[PDB]
DNA sequence: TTAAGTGGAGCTGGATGCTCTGT
DNA sequence: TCCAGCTCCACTTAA
RNA sequence: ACAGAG
């Protein structure tokens, strides 16, 4: 469910790490800078996959540290449109169902894409699903997070940059769906 | 007295001195005798590393008034200079980290 | 206070009645004494108005409206044939066009 | 030019600024790449004609 | 092949000792055995005499091409 | 011409797209360029340059001439792209003068640039199936009967054609075929015995190949020049005085050029037979009008002759100057009041006048006239002459004579109009773009009605259309449509000021 | 500042700049006239310049 | 920093399981330093991502299991996104294959669907 | 006869060394 | 206090 | 603005 993303970067290696092989010190430095962060158009970077080309290690005037331009590939959590995933619930709200996916947490199942025989709760947070023969209006979405299976239909990138001079919105949002037959909890299907 | 000649191509600098001169042939041809009144004011920022730590601890312990001494001290990733005339210099010499 | 220039060459021979000091800047939109003349109506002036808005919707649909080509599509899927934007392509008279313009 | 390197505060080109220095680190350019397993080209002939 | 001069110039010598002294001033490893030296420039000159400095001098011709000379293979002189 | 390049940047975007205006504006802004540098200086792919050039050489917007070493350079016509704004005025003036078939003939030519006669008589007759019903198709005779009547009146002209390579330069093919105009057969139509019926869009070799027809924009501007002069006489003297002016200019359609200060002189003996016979006027009363219209100091007409009874000419360049003055003085009143337009008519008549004579001659006192003088030098309606006593040119020893120049104020007033239309398009495209959530929501409730209109369309789909939350939102969509209909209409009416200004600026230029 | 009364500091004039060029000293001419007089940083928009 | 390619290649979640495990073998020999939170944001996203993978049916696989799962599925005329999801979740019934294959009742016959159930579960 | 291209004469705007040491 | 550019004006050739 | 010094 991932994509590799090919990137270029200029990495500063300070001179107290000249005892160590440069291929190891670059990989430690790029994981200190790209891990657990959402790059804007490509998504959430997990870790470095490999280094593919390693150019010259210049030393600029005014510094003793070696600067080198690095070509590399990074593994990125970025699910494509209309993909089927599995994950747990964080809880319930009138705004929707909050689905947890391990490391990642911002997955909104909207009320317009819920399964249709229940669409609104009885002034309660926990969402229901009314089946006629069994479990009328009480089949609940538990906050403890039993495993569900959902289908991503929308993803959005908001540019969390400073607007104005210096002297927390969710940047990588994801909208799933459950209304297809076969989606939902792993018990139901 | 404009910008280009007066303030850009040539400008006033610090870490500089100016005195009357006088001869001395007992020195070499590549040495110069700096007075001690100017050697205490002028400073060179020496970084702490493995080769000079025992030397710089003693130069901190002398302080700003005895001649092989130090006028300031700066922490590793801080931009603020502790003026070394005050405080106990035996404590700030023990806390010399690398960098 | 006295200036560098002579005030008497500017004016102010009496020595009084100097202009007041602007405390707050003028507004962005100073109000107008006069108004727009209202539009001309009639059965001729309104048919041209009706014909104009029909030309926007027409010329946006004609194949001379060269849209920009799409790119950076992520994956392939079977629903591409269902999402294929079909439109007939116009070909010029190459006898009138220069030779350097063949595709 | 030399006179506007002195104004803009970048080091000039004549003298010791004519050449660039490289650090001789223990580096392996083009290290052995990790092989992909799923998205190889021999198993994914496209669907459309 | 390499067609430029094999003698290290005074500018190459000066900037190599300068950059090596700035590296030894920070906590970089020293390639020679120091014997009580505290000034980093003196340790740089001991590394220069023993031909151990890990710097490659890249010489840019005015057209854009270059030549990578090692420090340990230029003829040092006074 | 920054206002022209801004306004042409919008007319190419609305009518052709975005990757064509970058080619189109760059040809207007810089000059005639070969093909390889347009892809360089703009940055598009070389294929998209060829698409953008073939759509601009189609609509007669860019030209091409061969230069040294056989390269082809493309030169845009900035005046031609601004005439894309006058398209709804062109389709209406062929509806008054010609039938609704001729309304569609001009429309297919203005929307395709160049068409063959065989293609346009098919496409008009196909589109006129919607306008008719009950078994009556449109046939190719009565379409072509309207078509050849246009070429007799020069509203449709032939394009410059390809040269005959069998007569001129056989052998190696040139990079560009170097087209040339032929004066004889611009209006000599090809004969078409082939007839047929317009298909009603049921959805279930060419003898004039190369003979392309285009709209003659210079003919309409000769026609619009008439109604500016004819309806000016209709307001001043009389409607019978106006039809005589209408009669002479209709006779002067084929016999004079479009740029002539004095037309062909017509004798009063043959105006009398040329007038429509519904006017109960004699020959002597006809001579009474021609001697009182000659008594006008505005000189719309003149005598200019003695032989053949009453010889008379009607003026062309001097009639535009009386209109461009009335164009320029209509805005002085509406912007600065009626008492300020008194001065602008005063300083125009007495050609060089000072402050003290204006306050006397116009009966407007000091400190109220001088405010109306000083707000016009800052708006460039009026200038000073500044006759000095010394070569020092000191302000305390000289005389400042006010002067109204018609030509410099008319070029200034035209430059305001180009920016005035560009602001109207920018306000409309702003309110169209910010309601893209409203219009698509109103489109989706209409798409349930539009899709499945007859086949399987039950009656239980008419109540779920107003049921969506767009029901209080219709207040804004009606506030939208009352805004778009006013800004589109004001976009058209400013073109009336442009044509009265641009004709005066064009006719005063000798172009040596 | 200027003089001995104001704790001034000395002047690398126009002529002493010309001597440091002749030695080819690039980083010393950088240290005297940028690092130890008036070093500063600015925020520059790379789009509008 | 700059990006040369947005979507280079599609990754099965087995390839990440082999990646994060072999990353762990050289990790946790040097702990975090509190010189920056770079070692903090690395450790949280590495441990928790492998735990999500360690409940998926991508465990117990090999390269050559994936090399033969694409070999048997070569002659079924499916897209890359439709061949990927059959490996990550291991479909076992024919209801979710109507989700993983678009227009599944129109491209694939009911026997062709039911043979695909036998193809997945016998390899995986 | 005069249109024009180029000489010679007058007007204009620029510049004139490096630092400290005091009133 | 000394010195290059810029502009004005007679002075031949050429038609 | 003036005087010094090299």
PDB file of N, CA and C in Angstrom, chain B residues 34-43 64-71:
ATOM      1  N   UNK B  34      54.052  42.238  21.663  1.00  0.00           N
ATOM      2  CA  UNK B  34      52.769  42.854  21.983  1.00  0.00           C
ATOM      3  C   UNK B  34      52.796  43.221  23.458  1.00  0.00           C
ATOM      4  N   UNK B  35      52.407  44.432  23.838  1.00  0.00           N
ATOM      5  CA  UNK B  35      52.321  44.760  25.258  1.00  0.00           C
ATOM      6  C   UNK B  35      51.207  43.991  25.947  1.00  0.00           C
ATOM      7  N   UNK B  36      51.364  43.807  27.260  1.00  0.00           N
ATOM      8  CA  UNK B  36      50.443  42.966  28.019  1.00  0.00           C
ATOM      9  C   UNK B  36      49.108  43.680  28.209  1.00  0.00           C
ATOM     10  N   UNK B  37      49.119  45.012  28.162  1.00  0.00           N
ATOM     11  CA  UNK B  37      47.872  45.766  28.239  1.00  0.00           C
ATOM     12  C   UNK B  37      46.998  45.559  27.010  1.00  0.00           C
ATOM     13  N   UNK B  38      47.593  45.172  25.886  1.00  0.00           N
ATOM     14  CA  UNK B  38      46.831  44.914  24.674  1.00  0.00           C
ATOM     15  C   UNK B  38      46.584  43.422  24.526  1.00  0.00           C
ATOM     16  N   UNK B  39      47.407  42.599  25.164  1.00  0.00           N
ATOM     17  CA  UNK B  39      47.222  41.161  25.040  1.00  0.00           C
ATOM     18  C   UNK B  39      46.080  40.670  25.911  1.00  0.00           C
ATOM     19  N   UNK B  40      45.692  41.448  26.915  1.00  0.00           N
ATOM     20  CA  UNK B  40      44.541  41.078  27.721  1.00  0.00           C
ATOM     21  C   UNK B  40      43.237  41.497  27.080  1.00  0.00           C
ATOM     22  N   UNK B  41      43.251  42.553  26.282  1.00  0.00           N
ATOM     23  CA  UNK B  41      42.045  43.028  25.628  1.00  0.00           C
ATOM     24  C   UNK B  41      41.735  42.207  24.392  1.00  0.00           C
ATOM     25  N   UNK B  42      42.732  41.981  23.550  1.00  0.00           N
ATOM     26  CA  UNK B  42      42.576  41.175  22.344  1.00  0.00           C
ATOM     27  C   UNK B  42      42.414  39.714  22.723  1.00  0.00           C
ATOM     28  N   UNK B  43      41.424  39.055  22.143  1.00  0.00           N
ATOM     29  CA  UNK B  43      41.160  37.649  22.397  1.00  0.00           C
ATOM     30  C   UNK B  43      41.024  36.871  21.097  1.00  0.00           C
ATOM     31  N   UNK B  64      40.306  36.858  33.931  1.00  0.00           N
ATOM     32  CA  UNK B  64      40.555  38.011  33.061  1.00  0.00           C
ATOM     33  C   UNK B  64      41.683  38.919  33.508  1.00  0.00           C
ATOM     34  N   UNK B  65      42.347  38.652  34.625  1.00  0.00           N
ATOM     35  CA  UNK B  65      43.304  39.621  35.136  1.00  0.00           C
ATOM     36  C   UNK B  65      44.745  39.143  35.096  1.00  0.00           C
ATOM     37  N   UNK B  66      44.990  37.859  35.271  1.00  0.00           N
ATOM     38  CA  UNK B  66      46.312  37.275  35.099  1.00  0.00           C
ATOM     39  C   UNK B  66      46.454  36.949  33.621  1.00  0.00           C
ATOM     40  N   UNK B  67      47.674  37.066  33.074  1.00  0.00           N
ATOM     41  CA  UNK B  67      47.802  37.229  31.625  1.00  0.00           C
ATOM     42  C   UNK B  67      47.439  36.009  30.783  1.00  0.00           C
ATOM     43  N   UNK B  68      47.960  34.769  31.012  1.00  0.00           N
ATOM     44  CA  UNK B  68      47.409  33.663  30.217  1.00  0.00           C
ATOM     45  C   UNK B  68      46.012  33.292  30.688  1.00  0.00           C
ATOM     46  N   UNK B  69      45.029  34.106  30.318  1.00  0.00           N
ATOM     47  CA  UNK B  69      43.707  34.004  30.883  1.00  0.00           C
ATOM     48  C   UNK B  69      42.639  34.183  29.832  1.00  0.00           C
ATOM     49  N   UNK B  70      41.400  34.290  30.298  1.00  0.00           N
ATOM     50  CA  UNK B  70      40.244  34.273  29.423  1.00  0.00           C
ATOM     51  C   UNK B  70      39.242  35.318  29.878  1.00  0.00           C
ATOM     52  N   UNK B  71      38.618  35.980  28.913  1.00  0.00           N
ATOM     53  CA  UNK B  71      37.679  37.042  29.217  1.00  0.00           C
ATOM     54  C   UNK B  71      36.231  36.616  29.072  1.00  0.00           C
TER      55      UNK B  71
END
